[PDB]
Amino acid sequence: PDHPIQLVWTDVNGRLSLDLSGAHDCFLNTRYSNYPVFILCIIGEKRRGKSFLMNYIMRALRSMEMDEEISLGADDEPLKGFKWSPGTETTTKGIWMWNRPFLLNHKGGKIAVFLLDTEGSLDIESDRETCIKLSALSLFISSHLIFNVASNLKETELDYMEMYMNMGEECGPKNLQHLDILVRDWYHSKKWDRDVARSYISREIEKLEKLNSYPKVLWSLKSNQTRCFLLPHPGKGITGESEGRLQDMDEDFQESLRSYVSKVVKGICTHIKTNIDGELLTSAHVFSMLQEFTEVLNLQIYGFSSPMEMFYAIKNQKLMGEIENEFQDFLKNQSSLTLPPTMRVKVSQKFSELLEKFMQFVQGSNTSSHDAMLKDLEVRLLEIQEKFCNDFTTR
Ligand SMILES: Nc1nc2c(ncn2[C@@H]2O[C@H](COP(=O)(O)OP(=O)(O)O)[C@@H](O)[C@H]2O)c(=O)[nH]1
């Protein structure tokens, strides 16, 4: 009985918890463990139709799995999410996924398509750091991210997008992070004009070019790497009480949804992701990356206010560890027969140089986190230095 499963939740203390058994049963089944995997994620504001679009994309994927044509019936009831929220039930917040993948055919192989809904993100101020960490975990394992927006792009959303752009830099050789900005309720009827979409795009690109911020999303927009899709209002047949049927939809919304679902489920085969090793990603790889990035986020104890800031904090904590190891190795190379005075001079100078190197290689502009990291690095290197010297006493 295929059902939705909650993969990652946020504990009361802010730690990110993972369903190890569920992720093992989903990503490591012997059937599709080595099939190339494709994770589709929907991030956006609540009550905007993310689960609805995911359910229709799911029906299209079922059609593709059984035969070869994308079809959706005119009177069929929904499945998963809210469009088919269980009679008298609703949903929780976190990362949710479809327990069973969808196997498609591409150039002699089977692609395992996983559907990931991020019910709960883009908060106003309700536990901001934890929401950032959850959405970052989602964006880390995603091969195609659909950002469900409701108007012009907001700073929060643009920062999330820049983070998604940056979180694929060491995930493959020439990895292109594919992003689909889905604007909801942008127009009513009016059929469609290819003018409204490129007008939205022109507005956004002007805003970003003046911002001198969010540069990589700006490049992706001006390079047609990230694509924007603007569908009309669903109509009162979907809003409120409804069984999410296409007979309950506006025909313009129906056709726009069909076009978008075609876009999304027909570009999977043409955009498989490669890892740094040069191989294609599989579901077991995704399980491993899930665990690894969950623990990486649970260990980011420094402060941040934006997604990009948490990205830079991850990187700078890694820099801290690298400098610690460099100092320890420098001390390991030092002889036990060196002149103690010149030895203390040398070690103090390595201390100073490593601190300056941290300062020159730090990333981001949050000088507060920079100072905190430098202070803690100073304390650790001081411990290392005094330890080496203390042992040098008895020698
Ligand atoms: N305004 C609007 N509502 C929609 C759209 N698609 C679905 N809805 C409705 O908005 C409600 C919330 O849907 P939901 O799937 O739960 O969105 P989600 O919470 O972000 O995942 C549902 O009852 C849908 O029927 C849309 O394109 N625009």
Numbering used by the authors: 149 to 543
Text taken from the publication that reported this structure:
Recently, RNF112 has emerged as an intriguing addition to the dynamin-like large GTPase superfamily, which has been widely implicated in mediating biological membrane remodeling events, including membrane tubulation, fission, and fusion. To obtain an architectural overview of RNF112, we carried out structural studies on modified Xenopus laevis RNF112 constructs in different nucleotide-loading states. For these constructs (collectively denoted as RNF112T), the N-terminal RING domain, the predicted transmembrane helix, and the C-terminal amphipathic helix were removed.
We also determined another GDP-bound RNF112T structure derived from a nucleotide-free RNF112T crystal soaked with GDP (RNF112T-GDP form 2). In this structure, parts of G2/switch I and G3/switch II are disordered, whereas the G1/P-loop and G4 mediating the GDP molecule become discernable compared to the nucleotide-free structure.
